[PDB]
Design a protein around this ligand. Structure first.
Ligand SMILES: [Cd+2]
Ligand SMILES: [Cd+2]
Lengths: 97, 96
């Protein structure tokens, strides 16, 4: 849903998760190598992401994995949102302000 | 990031931004594209300009409103693949 999709995709670590899952889908905490952040730290944000649907927790040839929800997010994130790659930044809100 | 996708995943603003693409004519022309009042639709632009997602221009006779760049017109215009985001009754938290 719109008010889940946008809050989970426009987030510091979760944008970084979702794009590193594209080149990942290994094991629980594998994103720690992709991000440099602890396997504790990165898994915290997945406890939102699996509820927002955006990641699907699966099994592979020997262990459990976290994949993007479908080809859907793997494609639309893989074009890149084009906004220079959204990062956290000190820019304000409201027009003319 | 946190200005971008808060204004990009909003009820009327996703609707503005996709209707701007097929419009960019005049202030409140979006009222025809959305079926919503020219005041009501313009209220949301008072965020959208500050969030950087829209820029005001001039054309051959009046002022216009356009998407920030080709950047948002392309990534919106592929379609974000999420079935077209609309307000929908779906929850949060994993395993819950
Ligand atoms: Cd969530
Ligand atoms: Cd704003």
């Amino acid at each position: 849903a719109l008010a889940r999709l946008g809050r989970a995709l426009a987030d510091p670590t979760r944008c970084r998760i979702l794009v590193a899952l594209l080149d990942g889908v290994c094991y629980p905490g594998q994103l720690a190598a992709h991000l440099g952040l602890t396997r504790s730290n990165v898994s915290n944000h997945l406890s939102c992401l699996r509820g927002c649907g955006l990641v699907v927790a699966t099994y592979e040839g020997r262990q459990v994995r976290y994949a993007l929800a479908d080809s859907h997010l793997a494609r639309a994130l893989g074009e890149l949102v084009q906004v220079v790659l959204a990062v956290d930044t000190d820019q304000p809100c409201v027009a003319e302000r």
